[PDB]
Curated annotation (Swiss-Prot), chain B:
N-acetylated by NAT1. It comes from Saccharomyces cerevisiae (strain ATCC 204508 / S288c) (Baker's yeast). This is 26S proteasome regulatory subunit 6A. It comes from the Eukaryota. It is found in: Cytoplasm; Nucleus. Belongs to the AAA ATPase family. The 26S proteasome is involved in the ATP-dependent degradation of ubiquitinated proteins. The regulatory (or ATPase) complex confers ATP dependency and substrate specificity to the 26S complex.
Swiss-Prot record, chain D:
The modification Phosphothreonine is found at T57. The 26S proteasome consists of a 20S proteasome core and two 19S regulatory subunits. The 20S proteasome core is composed of 28 subunits that are arranged in four stacked rings, resulting in a barrel-shaped structure. The two end rings are each formed by seven alpha subunits, and the two central rings are each formed by seven beta subunits. The catalytic chamber with the active sites is on the inside of the barrel. Interacts with CIC1. The gene is PRE6. This is Proteasome subunit alpha type-4. It is found in: Cytoplasm; Nucleus. Its main location: cytoplasm.
Swiss-Prot record, chain E:
One of its GO terms (biological process) is proteasomal ubiquitin-independent protein catabolic process. GO terms for cellular component: nucleus; proteasome complex; proteasome core complex, alpha-subunit complex; proteasome storage granule. The keyword Phosphoprotein applies. Gene3D superfamilies: Glutamine Phosphoribosylpyrophosphate, subunit 1, domain 1. The 26S proteasome consists of a 20S proteasome core and two 19S regulatory subunits. The 20S proteasome core is composed of 28 subunits that are arranged in four stacked rings, resulting in a barrel-shaped structure. The two end rings are each formed by seven alpha subunits, and the two central rings are each formed by seven beta subunits. The catalytic chamber with the active sites is on the inside of the barrel. This is Proteasome subunit alpha type-6. The proteasome degrades poly-ubiquitinated proteins in the cytoplasm and in the nucleus. It is essential for the regulated turnover of proteins and for the removal of misfolded proteins. The proteasome is a multicatalytic proteinase complex that is characterized by its ability to cleave peptides with Arg, Phe, Tyr, Leu, and Glu adjacent to the leaving group at neutral or slightly basic pH. It has an ATP-dependent proteolytic activity. PROSITE patterns: PROTEASOME_ALPHA_1, PROTEASOME_ALPHA_2.
From Swiss-Prot, chain F:
This is Proteasome subunit alpha type-5. The keyword Chaperone does not apply. InterPro entries: Ntn_hydrolases_N, Proteasome_alpha, Proteasome_alpha-type, Proteasome_alpha_type_5, Proteasome_asu_N, Proteasome_sua/b. PANTHER family: PROTEASOME SUBUNIT ALPHA/BETA. Changing G43D: In DOA5-1; slight decrease in activity. It comes from Saccharomyces cerevisiae (strain ATCC 204508 / S288c) (Baker's yeast). Keywords: Cytoplasm, Nucleus, Phosphoprotein, Proteasome.
Length: 242, 72, 241, 236, 231, 244
């Protein structure tokens, strides 16, 4: 009763199926997003379940337009399908208005779609939380999108298993910086709380992937942090939890 | 730990035995050491052949073959 | 018997599905209070800032449909954005096809008809938001119409929404007993905000911050929101009265 | 809409076919006997109730072609739908292939309506069985086919469908032979009258006979004719 | 049966149960083992007959002269994904003058499976593909889950007894990656991987089907006496 | 449960209705098939139900084209859809290429029709709710691999066989095939082999008004043997049972 679909509704004012889908995201990989003054630094835990895997070749990070990074947790196919839909939407905006789509605008369009599948019985609710943001002319933004189809602005966000370790230390981060930190600084702080969030995933071992969109490092374009700079952050984070 | 109690061949290696089991638990490994000695008595041999340890895995899994297949 | 699962009638002459929509708007705990002034309509509403990691400026429940019509939304925020988008789409449609901005009375009725159609589909679940529309039209003066997830609306002298909104209704009613007119006479829009906040404070027994409130004001032919500094000035003036 | 009204069974069956045949069972009785120079479809007519104007009441045998006849058993609602559709098929063989339809073509067509509703969803097969018979043009070979609500067809020398079809079937084992069908129009007609007088009984009022003779001859035998065969056979 | 007859419900455990059932189609099916080096990818599939009167059925489908897939699960589910992959691969050559990237074809395939698992009256396809090819980024070996998920590996397996194959490939992991330019050696090591995936099914020459793709070596499927050199 | 949906995965991990399809072959009148390199013979049981039946116009032998023959056994409501589709496919190949279609390619096309269960799975149009209930013995000769025999399932899967027997009596037939198939059979020795295995799973007197033989030969094309020839072959089998 009251979970047989999503046009059932309970006398509790809850939809159960949709709350259940948040539990799929709780079974995902840890992913964080730090809203910085001049950008956003995303980081995501990529588990090494075998030495059979090929490192930094399975991205959970897909770019939308050119300046919006999207990274997620939960059911990996469902989130890649969500981002495929939103890449079509990004293109349409660029078509019609001849400008890259803003971060508040991109959020609204994704939110309607995920919101639609929790009303129809012909299409299955989502089981993804996506953390996405970037830099446009209206500033840096960070958004977290629930599978229920909710989002807000954030000074810090996380989702996945190891959000318990991540979320707490972002309260200390705001308390470090009540006027935020540099894009440079956030490279070593996004790495640091994946390594502290590796204590909810300490069964296994992991590979750090880092990406950013910031005005002052890449010029408000989303690029991958690669080479010696990715490895500098990994060396920093590695020392903190030891 | 079962083979501690019983007479066995010395040409068996517990790592070979660990290759050929995939997702087994200790009750099934009770069912492989004992099953070795069923095969052993049936041959007519005092000792429990090192081939009989491998053949207790397949003879008794917890099920007889892997089920129907008709398009897989 | 599925009369609680799909949108068909029961032998009680009531659609249970539809009733459950009203029981979701009290779960997010947003209260609103809306009064008609003499040149404005003012709506003050709660803003829940739960963590230090939410940015309160992007936390919204006030969507600006048209140039002159704000809408405040009480109930879940997914359904809020879907409703806000729809309301905007139809208003722009109305300006486009009839050559003038949509009135508030007619906007309430248009969303009421689509909400009723969402209680007539059994594969489209109604949106569980109660929508208040505030304006000052020049054809109806200051106006409030409140639509609900059933498809019913009516005009209001003042209105409230939320779980504790019965408490608010009492205060407002007394205020209109004394004046013996259906709107507050006060020509400064600022002092109508101050009165609105007084009635909210009585009802909920809580004093407010600037980031516990989010205020929208419809003056003559423009709708804007107050920023957080401006809200604090109003709350400073409560003490001056 | 395509929400299966026909769906597979755990016995490897389809539910609607099993139900359809029982719907054909409880309906009227058709007997088909073919000679060497005729076909005869005689069928059971429900006109038991009085104050029924039997003349304007729908027939159990409907001509589709000027030498192809069709009779039916099962739902009386469904059969008339098929009989409109068949008429279109008849004009379409003429349209694109010229010549009036062959019996064998028309048998595959009725079955093809059934077939459609068998595999797809949102539809269910008609509970209708037919005896299709007649001549092909410039043939004086009788053709006797049977369709069933599955979408299957069978050729016969004699066949009976409907209620107590087994009683009639056994009676024709001891009279009719595949080897040497009746060599006369009247002998064929009288054998079909004799079989119907077992179960249907109740005179020429419930019993009908239609005769097709080779190469574009359809004739209908009136109540009076049917009654004269009845009395002679009764006596004999 | 509560949510197990439906493909549109969660599932208090944060699953869909249909995805786990689609996974059991791999277990009942055939086994295939893939391993790659930098300069070569290799599929060794175990073909399977029904009885002795029956010949064995090809479990490797050639998609292109640089691409191939293999089925381990149900064949009719494979028949949907194989057509779609072939069409989008000819399309890449037609429009973009491009050999279809193995990674990217994996992502288009992922989302396709997803939207039939989302839809009611659909399913997640009960076929796991190992998809090899040699493109501009070198060799690739992908793993296709019933869900849609693609993971890139130097060695993986699916089927029954696949666990023992991956034990073998983790042991010889750095050996076969450092033989490059000799297609002969990768194939030989894949024969030994799938020998740990026998339950006395035996390797003969008409059971055994190998296909490889190289830096300069087209996607070619060997059978007959072209696999008899690798036993 | 798992039979109310035409596309659902079960707690075994493969389709339940499809199993029921395999158990709808066991309602068919046995179709037996022996392939050799001298041509391939198909025989089918017609099944007489009454002496009122006209059986020499009923057959489960079907021509798909000149160079491909077919025998069907199982639900024949389903087989009408598939045979008409096979007939189009062959003709399309000859339209497009002016060339003979391979037996393997023709069979594979019919398997694509067989996979059309679902009403909301993938992109391709679903013209059914469920699977079929019939298997095929498409025999033939193509000039590439010579004579061929394929057995096609309503699953949407196919195998090349050298001999296959489907229908109700399929298991009892298949036991005889294991011991009686060899590579040094002839066309005529194969033809007598069909009737031998058919006689055991026949429930009546084996005769020529309830059995039909057909060959596919390179130089004669597809020929359906007349009941005179069937009657002769049947009698000579009894003479080789007068040798034991």
């Amino acid at each position: 009763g009251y979970d047989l679909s999503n046009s059932v509704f309970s006398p509790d004012g809850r939809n159960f199926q949709v709350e259940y889908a948040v539990k799929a995201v709780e079974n995902g990989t840890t992913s964080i997003g730090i809203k910085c003054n001049d950008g956003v630094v995303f980081a995501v835990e990529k588990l090494i379940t075998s030495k059979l895997l090929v490192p930094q070749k399975n991205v959970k990070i897909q770019v939308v337009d050119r300046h919006i990074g999207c990274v997620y947790s939960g059911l990996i196919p469902d989130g890649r399908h969500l981002v495929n839909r939103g890449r079509e939407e990004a293109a349409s905006f660029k078509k019609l208005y001849k400008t890259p789509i803003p971060i508040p605008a991109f959020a609204d369009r994704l939110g309607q779609y995920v919101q639609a599948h929790t009303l129809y019985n012909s299409v299955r609710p989502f089981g993804v939380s996506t953390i996405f943001g970037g830099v446009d002319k209206n500033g840096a933004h960070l958004y977290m999108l629930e599978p229920s189809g909710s989002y807000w602005g954030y000074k810090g966000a996380a989702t996945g298993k190891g959000r318990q370790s991540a979320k707490a230390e972002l309260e200390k981060l705001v308390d470090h910086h009540p006027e935020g930190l540099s894009a440079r600084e956030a490279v070593k702080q996004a790495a640091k709380i994946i390594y502290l969030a590796h204590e909810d995933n300490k069964e296994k071992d992991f590979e750090l992937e880092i990406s950013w969109c910031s005005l002052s490092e890449t010029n408000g374009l989303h690029k991958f942090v690669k080479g010696d700079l990715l490895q500098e952050a990994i060396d920093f984070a590695q020392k903190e939890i030891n | 730990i079962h083979s501690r109690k019983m007479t066995t061949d010395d040409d068996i290696n517990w790592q070979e035995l660990a290759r050929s089991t995939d997702e087994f638990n200790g009750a099934q490994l009770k069912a492989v050491t004992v099953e070795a000695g069923m095969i052993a008595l049936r041959n007519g041999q005092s000792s429990v052949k090192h081939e009989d340890f491998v053949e207790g895995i397949s003879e008794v899994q917890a099920r007889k073959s892997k089920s129907v297949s008709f398009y897989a | 018997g599925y009369d609680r699962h799909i949108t068909i009638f029961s032998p009680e002459g009531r659609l249970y599905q539809v009733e459950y929509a009203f029981k979701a708007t009290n779960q997010t705990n947003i209260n609103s209070l809306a009064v008609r002034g003499k040149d404005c309509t003012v709506v003050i509403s709660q803003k829940k800032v739960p963590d230090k990691l939410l940015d309160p400026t992007t936390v919204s429940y006030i969507f600006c449909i048209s140039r002159t019509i704000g809408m405040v939304v009480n109930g879940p925020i997914p359904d809020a954005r879907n409703a806000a988008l729809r309301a905007k789409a139809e208003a722009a449609e109305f300006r486009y096809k009839y050559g003038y901005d949509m009135p508030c009375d007619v906007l309430a009725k248009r969303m009421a008809n689509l909400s009723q159609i969402y209680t007539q589909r059994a594969y489209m679940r109604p949106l569980g938001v109660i929508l208040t529309f505030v304006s000052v039209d020049e054809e109806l003066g200051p106006s409030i119409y409140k639509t609900d997830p059933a498809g019913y609306y009516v005009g209001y002298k003042a209105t409230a929404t939320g779980p504790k909104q019965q408490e608010i209704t009492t205060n407002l009613e007394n205020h209109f007993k004394k004046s013996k007119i259906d709107h507050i006479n006060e020509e400064s829009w600022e002092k109508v905000v101050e009165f609105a906040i007084t009635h909210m404070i009585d009802a909920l027994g809580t004093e407010f911050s600037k980031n516990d409130l989010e205020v929208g004001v419809a003056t003559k032919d423009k709708f804007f929101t107050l920023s957080a500094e401006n809200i604090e000035e109003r709350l400073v003036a409560i003490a001056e009265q | 809409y395509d929400r299966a009204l026909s769906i597979f069974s755990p016995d490897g069956h389809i539910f609607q076919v099993e139900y359809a045949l029982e719907a054909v069972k409880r309906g009227t009785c058709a007997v088909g006997v073919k000679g060497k120079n005729c076909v005869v479809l005689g069928c059971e007519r429900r006109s038991t109730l009085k104050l029924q104007d039997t003349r304007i009441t729908p027939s159990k045998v409907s001509k589709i072609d000027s030498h192809v006849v069709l009779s039916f058993s099962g739902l009386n609602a469904d059969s008339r739908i098929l009989i409109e559709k068949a008429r279109v098929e008849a004009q379409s063989h003429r349209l694109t292939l010229e010549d009036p339809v062959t019996v064998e073509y028309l048998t595959r067509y009725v079955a093809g309506v059934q077939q459609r509703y068998t595999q797809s969803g949102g539809v269910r097969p008609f509970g209708v069985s037919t005896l299709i018979a007649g001549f092909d043009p410039r043939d004086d070979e009788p053709k006797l086919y049977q369709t069933e609500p599955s979408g299957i067809y069978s050729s016969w020398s004699a066949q009976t469908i409907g209620r107590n079809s087994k009683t009639v079937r056994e009676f024709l084992e001891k009279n009719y032979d595949r080897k040497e069908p009746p060599a006369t129009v009247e002998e064929c007609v009288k054998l079909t009258v004799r079989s119907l007088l077992e179960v249907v009984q109740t005179g020429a009022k419930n019993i009908e006979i239609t005769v097709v003779k080779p190469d574009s001859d359809i004739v209908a035998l009136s109540s009076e004719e049917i009654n004269q065969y009845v009395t002679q056979i009764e006596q004999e | 049966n509560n949510y197990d007859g439906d493909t549109v419900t969660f599932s208090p455990t944060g699953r869909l149960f249909q995805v786990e059932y689609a996974l059991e189609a791999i277990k009942q099916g055939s086994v295939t083992v893939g391993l790659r080096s930098n300069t070569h990818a290799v599929l060794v599939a175990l073909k399977r007959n029904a009885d002795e009167l029956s010949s064995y059925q090809k479990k490797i489908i050639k998609c292109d002269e640089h691409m191939g897939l293999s089925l381990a699960g149900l064949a009719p589910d494979a028949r949907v994904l194989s057509n779609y992959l072939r069409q989008q691969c000819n399309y890449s050559s037609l429009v973009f003058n491009r050999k279809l990237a193995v990674e990217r074809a994996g992502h288009l395939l992922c989302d396709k499976a997803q939207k039939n698992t989302q839809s009611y009256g659909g399913r997640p396809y009960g076929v796991g593909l190992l998809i090899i090819g040699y493109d501009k980024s070198g060799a690739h070996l992908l793993e296709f889950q019933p869900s849609g998920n693609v993971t890139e590996l130097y060695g993986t397996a699916i089927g029954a007894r696949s666990q023992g194959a991956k034990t073998y490939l983790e042991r010889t992991l750095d050996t076969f990656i450092k033989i490059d330019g000799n297609p002969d050696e990768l194939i030989k090591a894949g024969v030994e991987a799938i020998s740990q995936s026998l339950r006395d099914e035996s390797l003969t020459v008409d059971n055994l089907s190998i296909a490889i793709v190289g830096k300069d070596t087209p996607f070619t499927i060997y059978d007959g006496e072209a696999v008899a050199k690798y036993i | 449960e798992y039979d109310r949906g035409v596309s659902t995965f079960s707690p075994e991990g493969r389709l339940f209705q499809v199993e029921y399809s395999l158990e709808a072959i066991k309602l068919g009148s046995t179709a037996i098939g022996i392939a050799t390199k001298e041509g391939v013979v198909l025989g089918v049981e017609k099944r007489a139900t009454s002496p009122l039946l006209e059986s020499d116009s009923i057959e489960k032998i079907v021509e798909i084209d000149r160079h491909i023959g077919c025998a069907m056994s199982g639900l024949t409501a389903d087989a009408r859809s598939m045979i008409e589709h096979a007939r189009t496919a062959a003709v399309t190949h000859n339209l497009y290429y002016d060339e003979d279609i391979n037996v393997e390619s023709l069979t594979q096309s019919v398997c694509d029709l067989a996979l059309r269960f679902g009403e909301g799975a993938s992109g391709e149009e679903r013209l059914m709710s469920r699977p079929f209930g019939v298997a095929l013995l498409i025999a033939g000769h193509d000039a590439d691999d010579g004579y061929q025999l394929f057995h096609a399932e309503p699953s949407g899967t196919f195998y090349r066989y050298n001999a296959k027997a489907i229908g109700s009596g399929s298991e009892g037939a298949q036991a005889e095939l294991l011991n009686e198939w060899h590579s040094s059979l002839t066309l005529k020795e194969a033809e007598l082999l069909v009737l031998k295995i058919l006689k055991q799973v026949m429930e009546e007197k084996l005769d020529e008004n309830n059995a039909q033989l057909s060959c596919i030969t390179k130089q004669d094309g597809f020929k359906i043997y007349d009941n005179e020839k069937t009657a002769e072959l049947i009698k000579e089998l009894k003479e080789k049972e007068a040798a034991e």
